[PDB]
Design a protein around this ligand. Sequence first.
Ligand code: HEM
Ligand code: HEM
Ligand code: HEM
Ligand code: FES
Ligand code: FES
Ligand SMILES: [K+]
Ligand code: NA
Ligand code: NA
Ligand code: NA
Ligand code: NA
Ligand code: NA
Ligand code: NA
Lengths: 33, 57, 157, 157, 156, 157, 157, 157
Amino acid sequence: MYVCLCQGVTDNQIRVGTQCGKCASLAKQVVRE
Amino acid sequence: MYVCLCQGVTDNQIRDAIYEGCCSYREVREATGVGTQCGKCASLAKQVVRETLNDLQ
Amino acid sequence: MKGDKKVIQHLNKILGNELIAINQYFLHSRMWNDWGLKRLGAHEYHESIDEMKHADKLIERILFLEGLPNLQDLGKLLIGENTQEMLQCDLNLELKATKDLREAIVHCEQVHDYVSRDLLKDILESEEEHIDYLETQLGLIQKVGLENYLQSHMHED
Amino acid sequence: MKGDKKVIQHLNKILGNELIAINQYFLHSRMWNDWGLKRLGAHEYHESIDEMKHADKLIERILFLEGLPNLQDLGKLLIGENTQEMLQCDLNLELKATKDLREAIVHCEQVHDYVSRDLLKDILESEEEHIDYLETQLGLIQKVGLENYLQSHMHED
Amino acid sequence: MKGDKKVIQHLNKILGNELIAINQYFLHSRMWNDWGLKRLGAHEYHESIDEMKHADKLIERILFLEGLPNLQDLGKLLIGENTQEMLQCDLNLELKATKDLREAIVHCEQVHDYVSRDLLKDILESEEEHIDYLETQLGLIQKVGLENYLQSHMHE
Amino acid sequence: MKGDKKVIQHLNKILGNELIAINQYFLHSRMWNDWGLKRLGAHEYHESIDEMKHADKLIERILFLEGLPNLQDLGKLLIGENTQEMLQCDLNLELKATKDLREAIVHCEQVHDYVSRDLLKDILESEEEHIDYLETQLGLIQKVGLENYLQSHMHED
Amino acid sequence: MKGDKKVIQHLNKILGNELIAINQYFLHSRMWNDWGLKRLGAHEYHESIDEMKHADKLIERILFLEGLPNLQDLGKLLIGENTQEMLQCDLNLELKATKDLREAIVHCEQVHDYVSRDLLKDILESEEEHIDYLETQLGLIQKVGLENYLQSHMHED
Amino acid sequence: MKGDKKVIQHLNKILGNELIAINQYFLHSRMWNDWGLKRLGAHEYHESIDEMKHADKLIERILFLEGLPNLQDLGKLLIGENTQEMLQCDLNLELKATKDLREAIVHCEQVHDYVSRDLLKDILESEEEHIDYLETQLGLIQKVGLENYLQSHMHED
Ligand code: HEM
Ligand code: HEM
Ligand code: HEM
Ligand code: FES
Ligand code: FES
Ligand SMILES: [K+]
Ligand code: NA
Ligand code: NA
Ligand code: NA
Ligand code: NA
Ligand code: NA
Ligand code: NA
């Protein structure tokens, strides 16, 4: 799914947060895994 | 009331069978057919028999 | 399984009561028609139908909660031999039904199943209206006398 | 008492069969709806209603003959777990029902209860039409494949 | 100020949840339409509309209780990338929504705000029907296969 | 007697409140009409009618529960002398009414009279809508000024 | 103040009687419905409504004359325990009401308030029609017997 | 993706502006309704609905161009505390919106995305109509006075 809608970053693209920042916690988590 | 719907036996018909000489539920059952099909009425029929025999004293 | 196990047991218990009432009212209805008391027969037919609709809603709710609706267990019918006994039999059944509904609602509230509570409260309201009708009929037998009461129920509305 | 006792036993046996079918079909209908197979759910709902109507006619005939309709004894419901097994359960039930109907008819003929025979024959025609439906659905599962068969029953007519 | 402060906080939280759902369902609807799955698109559009109507009732109730409706804070949308994931995303959202509704109702009951309770109960009934719908679709994908399921949602 | 005695006392208390409101609103309506403020008069007339309907439902429920509805004890009417004071009198009355409704509901819940609770909740929703109307009118007097507010209520909708 | 003070007192006295009758008839109506005597319940409901309309006209006339309509004082209701007593209670109330109306009319004529007289005469005509109905019902109980009389009032028209 | 990257950013910027307007107008509408200024409430509700329809068209266009519509980023709502402030808040918002629309149109023209330009021009015409409405209301407040202006917006139609 989209982790960041502002930048269109999916969880698979991580495997961002620069615009509104509401997704930061989630992206930081996907990373810490 | 009908006590046994399968065999169409009322509480008065259970009393009658006793008055006519039945001495136990098993005897009432042989006389009337009560509780010989689905069996769901058996405990209620037994209660009527019990109350009737007790009142006959 | 999303449903509370005791909620599902309560709903199945209410379902079992509805299933008894369906058959008892249907048979009472057809007995009254056989005797030519068509107004009682028609009223009692509609009571049976209303119980069928409650059972449907119960079955639907049990399935949503992922339980198994129990249509297999059919408890004892209370079938009367004359009009006064039949009405009283329906009333005896309904007093048991409302006691079970109140207990089911208590448990729904406790586990926060507010939608199941709301369904049961709706059924309870309908069963209380049936109790009202039954007590009224039994009272009318006393006020107008049994022969008049039966006369007034020969012809349909 | 105008009714032949064994005729009444036979009518009560058919009635007992209809009561099982009512409940079995109603539960299957509501299971298909819960799964989103609404076309199957609707069809099965109408099968249940049709058995209710047959039951009503049996109950009325039994009372006319001065017997007591048996709405107390409920036999074994054959509930399936998936679409194919549910259809087969309905078919197994119907095959037992039609066997009983034929025996009932033989006996009615023997004691000259030609009106009860005609009632039972009408019921039998309806049950055979149900068997035709059931065999057709099972055949279609084989012809179009299960996944297509189910797809085709998602949306109501 | 007639309203209980914690009731108003609960109503604002439920409103927050509805505002997320409005946007998530509307976007999912338009994605399904873009892909030519128009029956899913139309269904999802109506889910979005229904959340809008719930939001309206919450706003009206908050104002009556002399609270301040919060339409400013928008939480995280769960947007899927394909049909199966979009449905599961809607379901995850709904499971959270109903948990919060139950907690709000408990509180309304405690402070005797029975009318707020009934409003929330009606919302909860609607959200439970949406859960029913979502689980049904996820189950159909299993029963009829993904290709058939999508095919069945091309046309309205 | 199926009814809980304190439930019946609570229902009779709410009924007593509705009886005050019926009369207070009816008199205010007819005073607004006498003054030529026909829009206020019509609105207040409908508020009085609505309380009559609530009273009827309470009376019916009390009788079902085998209590005696109290139509004898009429509490204090809060009559105003001018438009603003009349609105405030209606508001003071409603604030007392809603407090009683909430206490009644608590007790119904405690003794599991879920149908009486639902009745009272419906009444409460209506009374809160009245409070919303009253607070709005008092706010409008401040926003548009009294003379404009009154002007706007001379002619009926 | 344009109105004669004693005229206003008389109108308030008639109003007070109407207010008693509203509540007495409304309660009798709902009692009859509770007992299943729906034709009596419906007739008595309409009697209550008719008293409400008289009260309205009285309140309007008192306001025009610049007096204060009194809705606060509610005298004693006469509530019966069975159908015959309830009818007699209504009749007792109506005989008092018509005596007061005649005295009010006398005073209106004396002070030349011919419009108030005309209003009271219209009310008097309606109350006399109610007296006719009541005496008729009590007479029918004697002619057809109480059980038949009640039977004839079970079902609505 | 078929769409120009800066066109999609512009469209997402316009979408972002519409999303603020939708919520800002919807809240203003319900505040006006709460205060009993129903005509303002109804008009503002329709302004909110019109912004929703613009948002829908932008979302559709962004998806056709293979971009990702941004419904996650919600900018600052300008909420006023009285009628004059709310209208000025809406106007402040619209002035910013039209500035962004013009910049977006300039860019679509430069990259020959004439269909996106036409969509934006249509939104722009709508937003300029809203500016006209807002400037007119602010001017009416000055011309007829605040109390009359609000009075004129109490009743719908
Ligand atoms: C002795 C058992 C039953 C009998 C004799 C019976 C009979 C009937 C009859 C005669 C009708 C009217 C059909 C028509 O002409 O449209 C009916 C309707 C219906 N039945 Fe039954 N029924 C029985 C049990 C049940 C049960 C156990 C259920 C559900 C679990 C059920 C569900 C329904 C429903 C939902 C309707 C439609 C009612 C409406 O919406 O008007 N029935 N039944
Ligand atoms: C126990 C007290 C009362 C009860 C329970 C009661 C009940 C009712 C009901 C149920 C209605 C019919 C409403 C509808 O469905 O349209 C009604 C109508 C009405 N009521 Fe009352 N009411 C009461 C007292 C009063 C009083 C004291 C007045 C005037 C002083 C009044 C004035 C009216 C009027 C004018 C109507 C309309 C009748 C018509 O034109 O059809 N009511 N009432
Ligand atoms: C992404 C944000 C939104 C979009 C895209 C959107 C879109 C729409 C659309 C297309 C309609 C149908 C208009 C018509 O054809 O007449 C509509 C109706 C409506 N909207 Fe929105 N909307 C949004 C946000 C909201 C919010 C946040 C609320 C309330 C808090 C709201 C309240 C309503 C209401 C009450 C309706 C009418 C529903 C009915 O038919 O009863 N909308 N919206
Ligand atoms: S969602 Fe990642 S920055 Fe807005
Ligand atoms: S009810 Fe007696 S055996 Fe079935
Ligand atoms: K007679
Ligand atoms: Na017969
Ligand atoms: Na496309
Ligand atoms: Na489901
Ligand atoms: Na005047
Ligand atoms: Na308000
Ligand atoms: Na009663």
